[PDB]
Amino acid sequence: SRLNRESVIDAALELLNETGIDGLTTRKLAQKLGIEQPTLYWHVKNKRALLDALAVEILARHHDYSLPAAGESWQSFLRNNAMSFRRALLRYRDGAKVHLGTRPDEKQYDTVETQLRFMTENGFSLRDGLYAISAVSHFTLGAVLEQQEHTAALENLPPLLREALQIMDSDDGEQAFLHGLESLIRGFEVQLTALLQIV
Amino acid sequence: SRLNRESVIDAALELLNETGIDGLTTRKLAQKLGIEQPTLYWHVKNKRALLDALAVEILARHHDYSLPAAGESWQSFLRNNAMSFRRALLRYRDGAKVHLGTRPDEKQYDTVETQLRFMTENGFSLRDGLYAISAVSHFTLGAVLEQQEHTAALENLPPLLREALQIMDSDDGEQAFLHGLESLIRGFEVQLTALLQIV
Ligand SMILES: CN(C)c1ccc(O)c2c1C[C@H]1C[C@H]3[C@H](N(C)C)C(O)=C(C(N)=O)C(=O)[C@@]3(O)C(O)=C1C2=O
Ligand SMILES: CN(C)c1ccc(O)c2c1C[C@H]1C[C@H]3[C@H](N(C)C)C(O)=C(C(N)=O)C(=O)[C@@]3(O)C(O)=C1C2=O
Ligand SMILES: [Cl-]
Ligand SMILES: [Cl-]
Ligand SMILES: [Cl-]
Ligand SMILES: [Cl-]
Ligand SMILES: [Cl-]
Ligand SMILES: [Cl-]
Ligand SMILES: [Cl-]
Ligand SMILES: [Cl-]
Ligand SMILES: [Cl-]
Ligand SMILES: [Cl-]
Ligand SMILES: [Cl-]
Ligand SMILES: [Cl-]
Ligand SMILES: [Cl-]
Ligand SMILES: [Cl-]
Ligand SMILES: [Cl-]
Ligand SMILES: [Cl-]
Ligand SMILES: [Mg+2]
Ligand SMILES: [Mg+2]
């Protein structure tokens, strides 16, 4: 079938949902596309190159809150941005593992730059803004990775542990994520407002 | 060579450092142990079973701050516990990926129970204590995963991005982790002390 970049991406994302990240192979992608492996190679050099592109395109397609609304507080931006990142990562099987290890692509530079500048315009030093943005990124990835990989992995319990596992087996991870996110953001705010004061 | 559980673990951890998680195979472990594959199978049924055991034994061996010191504040316990978890995860190649998706083993039940009880003794509801413990776990995993997988993965840059990448390429991830961790813990404290007050 059609082997423009868009269509190759499309097929690889469909395959990802079917196979997961470990099971995804270029041979299987060629099959899906109805082509021979050497044909695919002209378009897609290896699995690494494919995964890198998927990580970018999943966010381009589905991460809609990359930038602050006009007049938005930095707190609200980080909240909305994290929720959006989370959702985008969850949209595909093993989507957080596809993201893991990547760094901002040229196609995301202006976006990331804007996020950093926004933080510095709201009183963060570049370093402190970086630490905030990384912490949210790490927390969000971590939460989604554990959600997705725990699902992939699937009476002498002591009572709090039994109960805590009953709580966890009762939603998908969202409540715990959102509560953690609030804690994170509030801590960032306490730090920012402290300036040079012992806190 | 010797195929007691300890020695099999030992060899698998050595192999993990040599191959990484994706490259680790039972066939390669049998080679390392100087045995044939059917011999290994008696001891180790599959890679999953092996990884599960490694995740447990890495913490048993090297995560020394599972429990609060006598009289320790909950804040200090979470800090020390997170630092210890982080270090243990970093001790082996792809160590955070080995941990990912696991849940507490029978051999960790008393430990995890104690952590939960400790939080509830310090004023947390079980749910709020769970959310704190999960948030620290997720943040720590996320940070280490990104550190380890970014290393595994290894001029039109805009200036803040260029600068931020210079900052990141200057330590291993520790400074950003520790700063984030403080933000997280302080947010937990603001929440705990609020009780039923709008905050
Ligand atoms: C320079 N910049 C801080 C870095 C450095 C190394 C990194 O590994 C990363 C960044 C930017 C962050 C921005 C975060 C942002 N957010 C805090 C989740 C984000 O919304 C985006 C985005 N493209 O909209 C990211 O790329 C991002 O998810 C991401 O993957 C990043 C990331 O991987
Ligand atoms: C019931 N309990 C809260 C759960 C439920 C699901 C989970 O997936 C987990 C826990 C306990 C947490 C405790 C955390 C703890 N810490 C906050 C990092 C920890 O120190 C240990 C430990 N064994 O000392 C964990 O097992 C732990 O790393 C872990 O892997 C957990 C984990 O995987
Ligand atoms: Cl065709
Ligand atoms: Cl076609
Ligand atoms: Cl074509
Ligand atoms: Cl195209
Ligand atoms: Cl492949
Ligand atoms: Cl294949
Ligand atoms: Cl503020
Ligand atoms: Cl405070
Ligand atoms: Cl031998
Ligand atoms: Cl021997
Ligand atoms: Cl033996
Ligand atoms: Cl033994
Ligand atoms: Cl294997
Ligand atoms: Cl092999
Ligand atoms: Cl307190
Ligand atoms: Cl406050
Ligand atoms: Mg990223
Ligand atoms: Mg765990």
UniProtKB/Swiss-Prot annotation, chains A, B:
GO process terms (BP): negative regulation of DNA-templated transcription; response to antibiotic
A molecular function GO annotation: transcription cis-regulatory region binding
Pfam families associated with the record: TetR_C_1, TetR_N
PROSITE patterns given in the database record: HTH_TETR_1 (PS01081), HTH_TETR_2 (PS50977)
Protein name: Tetracycline repressor protein class D
Induction section of the entry: By the [Mg-tetracycline]+ complex.
Quaternary structure note: Homodimer.
Residue numbers binding Mg(2+): 99
Cited function: TetR is the repressor of the tetracycline resistance element; its N-terminal region forms a helix-turn-helix structure and binds DNA. Binding of tetracycline to TetR reduces the repressor affinity for the tetracycline resistance gene (tetA) promoter operator sites.
Binding-site list for tetracycline: 63, 81
Gene (name only): tetR
Organism expressing this protein natively: Escherichia coli
Keywords in alphabetical order: Antibiotic resistance, DNA-binding, Magnesium, Metal-binding, Plasmid, Repressor, Transcription, Transcription regulation
